Amino acid sequence: SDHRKIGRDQELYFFHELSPGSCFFLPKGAYIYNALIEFIRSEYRKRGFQEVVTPNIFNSRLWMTSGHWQHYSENMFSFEVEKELFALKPMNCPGHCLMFDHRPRSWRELPLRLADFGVLHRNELSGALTGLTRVRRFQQDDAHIFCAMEQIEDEIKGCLDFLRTVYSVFGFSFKLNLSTRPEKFLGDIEVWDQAEKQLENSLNEFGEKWELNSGDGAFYGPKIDIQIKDAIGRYHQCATIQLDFQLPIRFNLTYVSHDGDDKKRPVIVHRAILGSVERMIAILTENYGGKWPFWLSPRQVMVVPVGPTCDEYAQKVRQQFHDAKFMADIDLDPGCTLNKKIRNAQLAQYNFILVVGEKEKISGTVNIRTRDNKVHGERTISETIERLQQLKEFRSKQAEEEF
Amino acid sequence: SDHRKIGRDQELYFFHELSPGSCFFLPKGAYIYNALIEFIRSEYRKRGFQEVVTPNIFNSRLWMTSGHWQHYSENMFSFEVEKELFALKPMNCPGHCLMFDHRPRSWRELPLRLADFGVLHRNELSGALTGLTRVRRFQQDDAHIFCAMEQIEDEIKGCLDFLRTVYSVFGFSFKLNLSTRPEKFLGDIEVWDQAEKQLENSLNEFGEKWELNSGDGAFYGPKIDIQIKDAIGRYHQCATIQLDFQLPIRFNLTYVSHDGDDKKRPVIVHRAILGSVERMIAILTENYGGKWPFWLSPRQVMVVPVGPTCDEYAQKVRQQFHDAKFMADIDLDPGCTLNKKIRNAQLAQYNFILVVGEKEKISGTVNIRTRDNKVHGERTISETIERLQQLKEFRSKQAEEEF
Ligand SMILES: C[C@@H]1C[C@H](C)C[C@H](C)[C@@H](O)CC(=O)O[C@H]([C@@H]2CC[C@H]2C(=O)O)CCC/C=C(\C#N)[C@H](O)[C@@H](C)C1
Ligand SMILES: C[C@@H]1C[C@H](C)C[C@H](C)[C@@H](O)CC(=O)O[C@H]([C@@H]2CC[C@H]2C(=O)O)CCC/C=C(\C#N)[C@H](O)[C@@H](C)C1
Ligand SMILES: [Zn+2]
Ligand SMILES: [Zn+2]
């Protein structure tokens, strides 16, 4: 089960030597892409996240401040503009630190959750590059939570909840591990201790088992790492919750508290769930075997007529399903058998096959078979649309069966 | 007047030393961004356009093939990756040419309209840079039509229609210009002749007033230039329709005709309407004077309660408007006058101010005032939401008046 082959055969995405580590998404794959993105966006609008758009290149002084030239230079594409150094952003964080520092901010605005889907480029060796799993270019579901030390606990709760929701939609399971302060660390030990206290507390509060790795954290902060398990029984590292006490210092971030102190530093929480959209597309592709849930599927409805007798009506049907914002196609080919068309639609992984006969044209109705050839028998166009939009909006895992 | 200042005061967008020629979009400005993108997308789905996702960086051989090295190299950021030259994409065209050549294609698949919102980088001199008007990083509403020479006529009709529709929503006028074959040109004269014939043909068919700039066309094709006029009386060059015969040659693109003849070349139509999203954001900012139409507005509804007595009933109201996918805020400050709150809300360019009193909490209603201060008096939450939804969907140029 390979996402590259399945990628080619469904005309989702392909690859080319002219841009190694970067992907070409054909319209269907692009649909899947934007579908994932807007899923995350809906959840954002539930959870109080605010999306921003940031520059893709920056002067060397920013990667100076952030710690990227000292630490990350190898992975970064750099070039010289007007005698000054510039680089493509490997991460969204420093830009967001700039957005936070744009104007004086008070305690009233915290927690401030800034989200970015912006394009990230990382330099990775040509022989290391494979498919969508290891890539140079990717879009990440990225967010930074700026908060007071004390809000952190609640924030983490939210974070965990967020994860659950998303993965509950995919049907994935997950494992949690707490990586605490290592021997090599930068910061004030008190800050570390309170932070880790809150992390542990919200972890227990969450109610699910976790392991404590004791010193496997980073030098700039403690972290909660999350492993997801798919239906094939594969384990993936996708989501992350990473605290940062360093970045607010390096960029000199401050906020007004309620007791008047304006010199207070915030805590930065780097958070991601899907990881990168690309790698998540790979994972989902292999996990589903190319057989997509209705809400995620670039091929949703396939309209078939019984004969040229009634194409006019298939056309009207398909159009009515198109304006309902479904991905819907039609097979008008006179040189094909009805059974052959249905079989091809089911091989093309169309979730629902709507067959139209004479009774179908006369009564203003459609007849329904499924990708797995279940015949849900005859329905009104209105009813079919309503039920399908229910199964879409709720992102049902098996739609065909539950219809 | 000036979009930079307005961008600062409304917390839409700002600029920074560390990335000249790029932009920082705060949540509000970002909302505007994605709103424009979504508008163009809806119209795409009406008009049979298919969106794709393409790589941001490419090997130098691509830019050599398309001809950007021998021409456009001065505007391109280039850098070395593993001994080889690479560059960020100034345009989406070559990538789309790659996507066309991915597999064999027939006449049945034409016209094939591929759309890209992808991020483009062009190198502009630091002294040339001003705001969002002249930039380095920008996202373009970009599309390439691949069509048979004949279909071109009909296609242009569509293009024209599309322009009209979009600008009908904005309220801009436009003047049309046909730029034809220059003295220095590359191609077969007969191809040029037929193409220009069809162009003039659809131009007259459209019913609008167009002008003939014989000779001022590109060396690689004839073009229709469009100038938009706003409400300040400024003319802008944003939208373009550009024929390309050269690109299919250089990338060796073919298609199976219904003859059985596969050696026929497609014509490429480069098309943009908004130009770049950034440019259009600037234009709209200065055109609206920072006062946005209801559908484009990051500040739509502000809920104001009179007394803390019902701070909470407004919590409820603002929540119900938030789940209707409106951009809605609330003013709970006990240290402010009702009047001061209202006029602050209108100075902030909030489209609708919902004042909430005791009677309103009792009868489950709201009382409506307007950014310009009109007053629509009590109305129930339901019909208020429905009316605002209609005014959002139809994209009313004035919601405030027509509510
Ligand atoms: C610039 C260095 C680079 C470090 C050393 C990178 C290491 C490889 C790990 O620390 C990476 C990591 O987990 O980053 C984390 C990313 C979130 C998912 C992961 C991701 O995007 O991969 C986030 C950390 C961002 C950190 C910073 C920033 N800015 C830090 O202040 C600076 C000091 C970090
Ligand atoms: C490499 C040259 C660049 C030309 C010489 C530069 C000129 C300034 C204009 O030709 C640019 C232009 O109007 O391009 C047009 C762009 C659409 C809006 C405009 C836009 O994006 O600005 C479209 C043309 C793309 C063209 C190609 C490609 N690929 C051509 O085959 C090659 C020859 C283009
Ligand atoms: Zn981060
Ligand atoms: Zn183009």
Q: Where are the domains of chain B?
A: 1-289, 290-403
In B122-161, the residues whose Cβ lies within 8 Å of chain A are 123, 125-126, 136-137
Do A86 and B102 count as a contact with CB atoms less than 8 A apart? no
Which tokens go with B339?
């009047």
Among residues A77, A259, A2, A216, which one has the least CA distance to residue B81? A77
Which tokens go with B185?
């040109």
A315 vs A330: CA distance, rounded Å: 7
Beta bridge partners of A130: A134
Among residues A166, A117, A371, A87, which one has the least CA distance to residue B77? A87
Do A99 and B24 count as a contact with CB atoms less than 8 A apart? yes
Rg (C-alpha) for chain B, rounded Å, is 25
Among residues A240, A160, A153, which one has the least CA distance to residue A207? A160
- Asked if B158 and B47 count as a contact pair (C-beta separation under 8 A), the reply is yes
A140 vs B271: CA distance, rounded Å: 29
Among residues A248, A271, A220, A266, which one has the least CA distance to residue A115? A271
- Asked if A49 and A81 count as a contact pair (C-beta separation under 8 A), the reply is no
Which experimental method was this entry solved with?
A: X-ray
Yes or no: is domain A290-403 CATH 3.30.70.60?
no
Do A136 and B17 count as a contact with CB atoms less than 8 A apart? no
CB contacts, 8 Å: A325 with chain B: 45
Among residues B161, B157, B208, which one has the least CA distance to residue B43? B161
Q: For the purposes of burial, counting CB atoms within 10 Å of the CB of A375, is it exposed (0-12), middle (13-18) or buried (19 or more)?
A: exposed
Q: Give, for A44, the enclosing helix (H) or strand (E).
A: helix A27-47
3-state secondary structure of B271: strand
Question: Does B122 participate in catalysis according to the annotation?
Answer: yes
The dihedral through the CA atoms of B61, B62, B64, B65 has a sign that is positive
Do B16 and A56 count as a contact with CB atoms less than 8 A apart? no
Q: Tell me the CA–centroid distance for residue A187 and ligand 1, in Å.
A: 16
Do B77 and A79 count as a contact with CB atoms less than 8 A apart? yes
**Strands lying side by side in the sheet with B142-147:** B50-51, B112-116, B142-147, B267-272, B235-244, B223-229, B173-179, B210-213
B138 vs A55: CA distance, rounded Å: 9
B155 vs B368: CA distance, rounded Å: 46
- Strand locations in B195-336 (E): 210-213, 223-229, 235-244, 267-272, 301-305, 328-330
B305 vs B330: CA distance, rounded Å: 8
| Residue matched to tokens 């001022």 | B216
3-state secondary structure of A6: helix
The dihedral through the CA atoms of B120, B122, B126, B130 has a sign that is negative
Question: Does B142 participate in catalysis according to the annotation?
Answer: yes
B45 vs B51: CA distance, rounded Å: 9
| Residue matched to tokens 């000199």 | A252
Among residues A87, A83, A92, which one has the least CA distance to residue A61? A87
The closest CB to that of B52, out of A16, A30, A82, belongs to A30
Of the residues B23, B136, B141, B142, only one is catalytic, namely: B142
Q: Is the CB of A219 under 6 A from ligand 1?
A: no
A217 vs A199: CA distance, rounded Å: 13
- Strand locations in A34-125 (E): 50-51, 57-59, 78-81, 84-88, 112-116, 119-121
User: What is the dotted CATH code of the domain comprising A1-289?
Assistant: 3.30.930.10
Q: How far is CA B204 from the centre of its chain?
A: 27
Distance from CA of A172 to the nearest CA of B (A): 27
- Asked if A117 and A139 count as a contact pair (C-beta separation under 8 A), the reply is yes
Q: Give, for A147, the enclosing helix (H) or strand (E).
A: strand A142-147
Among residues B367, B363, B384, which one has the least CA distance to residue B375? B367
Q: Name which of B8, B19, B42 to mutate to probe chain A: the one with the most chain A Cβ atoms within 10 A of its Cβ.
A: B19
Residue A148, C-beta contacts closer than 8 angstroms, at least 6 positions apart:
A107, A110, A111, A255, A257, A264, A266, A267
B285 vs B298: CA distance, rounded Å: 12
Q: Which long-range contacts (CB under 8 A, 24 or more apart) does A330-338 make?
A: A330/A302, A330/A303, A330/A304, A331/A302, A331/A303, A331/A304, A331/A305, A332/A305, A332/A308, A334/A307, A334/A308, A338/A304, A338/A306
In B44-73, the residues whose Cβ lies within 8 Å of chain A are 45, 50-59, 61-62
CB contacts, 8 Å: A25 with chain B: 52-54
Q: Parallel, antiparallel, or unpaired: how do β-strands A235-244 and A223-229 relate? A: antiparallel
Do B290-403 and B1-289 have the same topology in CATH?
Answer: no
